[PDB]
Amino acid sequence: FKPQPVTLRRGALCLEPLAEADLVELLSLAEANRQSLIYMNGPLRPDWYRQGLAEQREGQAVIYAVRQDHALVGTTRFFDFMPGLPAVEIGGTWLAEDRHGSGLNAAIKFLMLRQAFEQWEMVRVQLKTAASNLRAQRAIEKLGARREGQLRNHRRLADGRLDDSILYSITDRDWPEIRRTLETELS
Amino acid sequence: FKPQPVTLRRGALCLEPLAEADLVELLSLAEANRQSLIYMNGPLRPDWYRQGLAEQREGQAVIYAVRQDHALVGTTRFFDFMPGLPAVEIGGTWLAEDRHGSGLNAAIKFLMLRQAFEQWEMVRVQLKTAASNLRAQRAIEKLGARREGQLRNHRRLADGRLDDSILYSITDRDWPEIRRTLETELS
Ligand SMILES: CC(C)(COP(=O)(O)OP(=O)(O)OC[C@H]1O[C@@H](n2cnc3c(N)ncnc32)[C@H](O)[C@@H]1OP(=O)(O)O)[C@@H](O)C(=O)NCCC(=O)NCCS
Ligand SMILES: CC(C)(COP(=O)(O)OP(=O)(O)OC[C@H]1O[C@@H](n2cnc3c(N)ncnc32)[C@H](O)[C@@H]1OP(=O)(O)O)[C@@H](O)C(=O)NCCC(=O)NCCS
């Protein structure tokens, strides 16, 4: 098993790797949305996507810009690669507020899980948010991902104060019945 | 915190760093208790020890050979360091069959926990053992840790047969009480 960069695409949407070149149009975008992005410190400081781009060369993550032939509307990434299994996470996912409520997320998740399950041949896909990020929480739960539990004192917010973290999973068995409820709102 | 090699001791029990010369005695001792270790990936492969020695220099694990006065009696390690909080894992624990229920673990645990929580001023210590691993699950419950959740499809046993894991964690508010007992324990 290895994770090589891939470009994922469904209709109007295009998922490509975070190149250097994008950090700019990615950054001030984040500054437009400094309200919706407050449960994931590491927003407008562009040391974030360089940390982002870094991880890849180590082989640690595979990190994505989300687009509609631009404009970038946000970013997501695979990471926490566990090849014995194999398994991965999704996370570091955020989107211009205009894209919320719109099912863009759903489109992103479907392309990434299908890749993860049907192509990487994985058995577990992690997804964690914060105990206080109820928006992120329902989203994952609209995705049909089992809530394995909250991990007390697991993160600090954009204020440097502690928060517990929720943790979800979707096994290899889960994937057909996950895949197909996305293929539902998508219709 | 800085994860520096440290020697902790309690009576006839000296947990001291792992050096490359211990590894040959540790693979041996492991093949002895080959059956009592089936719920763990790694332990009969010398390079699973080497791997912790290596990440000792990368800062990702401090790694302990457990001795009973003089006999190399087991291993147990620290890992999954999250500094931004900070918080740690304990794991990689295994003792030769003969010292099970003979009270050595409790002591190997207090020692580290007291190090991880009073010296390291940590806020979260997490442990995970196998869903199929029933002794381990009682032993962690005897510490005072909270069962945070089953984690499906998350691990493999010596067979390689997939399995689930159980997250247990202890925060700092829970320490005082956990220290306490493990002093009641010993008293
Ligand atoms: C989460 C994010 C993708 C927004 O996604 P999204 O497109 O709005 O997801 P959805 O469109 O399905 O809607 C989210 C759900 O949360 C609901 N919701 C939003 N705010 C809510 C609130 N205070 N309370 C309760 N529910 C709320 C929404 O109403 C919606 O549920 P609904 O259909 O019942 O109305 C992103 O914008 C973000 O800012 N941070 C994510 C950080 C993270 O955790 N990343 C890792 C997870 S992959
Ligand atoms: C650690 C290990 C050596 C067990 O040793 P131990 O720590 O001495 O066990 P302890 O005596 O501490 O506690 C075990 C207790 O659970 C009980 N127990 C529960 N279910 C049991 C079972 N199926 N078989 C045996 N004992 C069981 C034991 O009787 C014992 O006494 P008590 O519960 O009545 O007081 C070993 O089983 C192992 O393989 N470890 C896996 C390590 C791992 O992955 N976890 C890492 C996180 S530390």
Automatic annotation (TrEMBL), chains A, B:
Domain of life of the organism encoding this protein: Bacteria
Alphabetically ordered keywords of this record: Transferase
Presence of the UniProt keyword Transferase in the record: yes
Positions of transmembrane segments: none
Residues reported in the UniProt entry to bind CoA: 93, 101, 105, 109, 129, 135
Domain N-acetyltransferase: 13-173
Pfam annotation, one family: Acetyltransf_3
This protein's record includes keyword Nuclease: no
Molecular function terms from GO: acyltransferase activity, transferring groups other than amino-acyl groups
PANTHER family registered for this protein in UniProt: BLL6696 PROTEIN, N-ACETYLTRANSFERASE DOMAIN-CONTAINING PROTEIN
Protein name: GCN5 family acetyltransferase
Organism: Pseudomonas flexibilis
